Design a protein around this nucleic acid. Sequence first.
RNA 1: GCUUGAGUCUCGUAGAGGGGGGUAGAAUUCCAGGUGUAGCGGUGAAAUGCGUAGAGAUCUGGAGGAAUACCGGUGGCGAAGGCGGCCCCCUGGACGAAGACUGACGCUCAGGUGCGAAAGCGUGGGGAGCAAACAGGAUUAGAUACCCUGGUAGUCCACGCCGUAAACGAUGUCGACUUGGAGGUUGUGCCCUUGAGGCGUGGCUUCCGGAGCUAACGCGUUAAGUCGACCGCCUGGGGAGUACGGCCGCAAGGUUAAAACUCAAAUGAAUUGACGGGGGCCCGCACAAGCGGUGGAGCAUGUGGUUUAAUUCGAUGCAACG
Lengths: 117, 51, 150
Amino acid sequence: RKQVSDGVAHIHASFNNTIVTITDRQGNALGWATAGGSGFRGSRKSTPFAAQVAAERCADAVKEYGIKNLEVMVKGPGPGRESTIRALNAAGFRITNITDVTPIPHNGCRPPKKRRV
Amino acid sequence: IKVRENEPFDVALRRFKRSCEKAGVLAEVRRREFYEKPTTERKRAKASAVK
Amino acid sequence: RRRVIGQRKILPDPKFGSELLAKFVNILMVDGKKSTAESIVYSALETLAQRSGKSELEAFEVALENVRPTVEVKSRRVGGSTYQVPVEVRPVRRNALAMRWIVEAARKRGDKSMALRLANELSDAAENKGTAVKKREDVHRMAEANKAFA
RNA sequence: GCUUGAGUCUCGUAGAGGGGGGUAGAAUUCCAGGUGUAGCGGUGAAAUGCGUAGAGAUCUGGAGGAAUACCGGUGGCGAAGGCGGCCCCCUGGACGAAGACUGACGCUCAGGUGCGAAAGCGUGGGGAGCAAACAGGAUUAGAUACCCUGGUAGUCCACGCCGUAAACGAUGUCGACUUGGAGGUUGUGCCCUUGAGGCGUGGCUUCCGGAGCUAACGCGUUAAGUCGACCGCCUGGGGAGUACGGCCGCAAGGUUAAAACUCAAAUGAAUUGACGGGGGCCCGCACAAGCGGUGGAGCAUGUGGUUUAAUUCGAUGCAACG
């Protein structure tokens, strides 16, 4: 029912996971997939191969809308951050825009200590 | 960054664009901040440069 | 070690000639008995030869060059993996793995004579069934399902 | 009396100086609404936890608190503690540059007064994130921890209070002097300023090093050098920076501060070796990679234990155990 030829390909390059979500141009979600559906655990979640697995699942769930332009929103570290880009393109999308919205500390929150070992 | 390719390719590289962000900017903030610690280590690099 | 390993000459089959067929004698050497080995080889060859087309060299050769792996998994802490990472092996070690597995597979048969055992097993190598094949289907299953660099 | 000490005045210089008041954007969070769907989150693996009551992600709107990415640097400023977006207002200190006055008015300081990070305590606000505490989960044999998921106080603000910190350049303060190198920063005079620059002269500031000093490490013109002035302190370690008392504090305790007893050292710096689940490097069937064993079974053979009048004696981690 949406169909506008363009949409942001949002990618959340999590350092612990990788989510891939294709949103509308107007920020209205259309599809998503992740490492957990790919069938991974651990830090294996976060690899180039695994990112393909999700980037491509997601493609079957958004292609029938007719989207084929990208506005890449690389967000966070997390390997496999460009597997996804390349994957999309290499599957009936086209690149247009590489954009950054990424949270940047100004230390508006206080970071935890995490694992100190 | 919001730098972008000018013609549509995967030849054009986006790990260029990790020039200004994630460059002391991320991938080391997830730890608590102490005023002593980043101040101290800087003084290691100027014995380096002169020597 | 200093330098890298050398190669060591091995003689091919005399009656039909295939290095690879002779590397199958090597794999079937237990007790050191090459003599009692040279029996079984032809013994399994004929079984193959009747039932199957191609050459008699490609009753073994081809049939095996599709149930040999192309990935072996070891592991090391280099890459930042604690996990078993795929390794595309040299084509010669491809063989060695399968040949070995096929031979374990005919001492798991009590189907009388290491001829008739190992024979019917290799006939099912072209038919792509038999627990010899399924070892590949466990390695490559792990590696591609749980890829962690390469 | 004199001016070169000190000090003021003058004219400027730069700066996260301070305090109060304004204010911005990013980010995180929550709340609201939309979209969208079966997982999210976490880890070394996991589980607790959070998901179809529709989360996570994504967008849109709103609210709030705290902190200011970059800047940003042994960079700068402050007596020290210490101080980071941005602006305003009130205001402090330093410095430099001319001259000019004052006329030793100074230095330091027991007592005393003042400033004092953080935590903490009282009263009222405020509450995002993190997080003592606290509760699960995990690890371990245990685990009141490290580790994960949460989360209260607290952190934040106003006001008062306590006054401690390996309060650190571990160097009292001030002054006076004594080889130098390279760098930082910040003024100023001068040079076809005919260079983005060249020579001077100061202020503050780092790294290196000569002499010298020191036990050495090093310190090295901003000294631990060479001097002085005054003060503070120390006088074996443990006992013990505790007790007892006094003093201060709302309290916590701070502040002052022992003695008995007890030991023959305690301690510093450096050398050598050794070790390090330190680092860098490099090897060996050390491992990986393979192939075969042993331990299962019986027997041979040695030993231990036990028994026997004696089970001759020695060997005991590898490096005793055909």
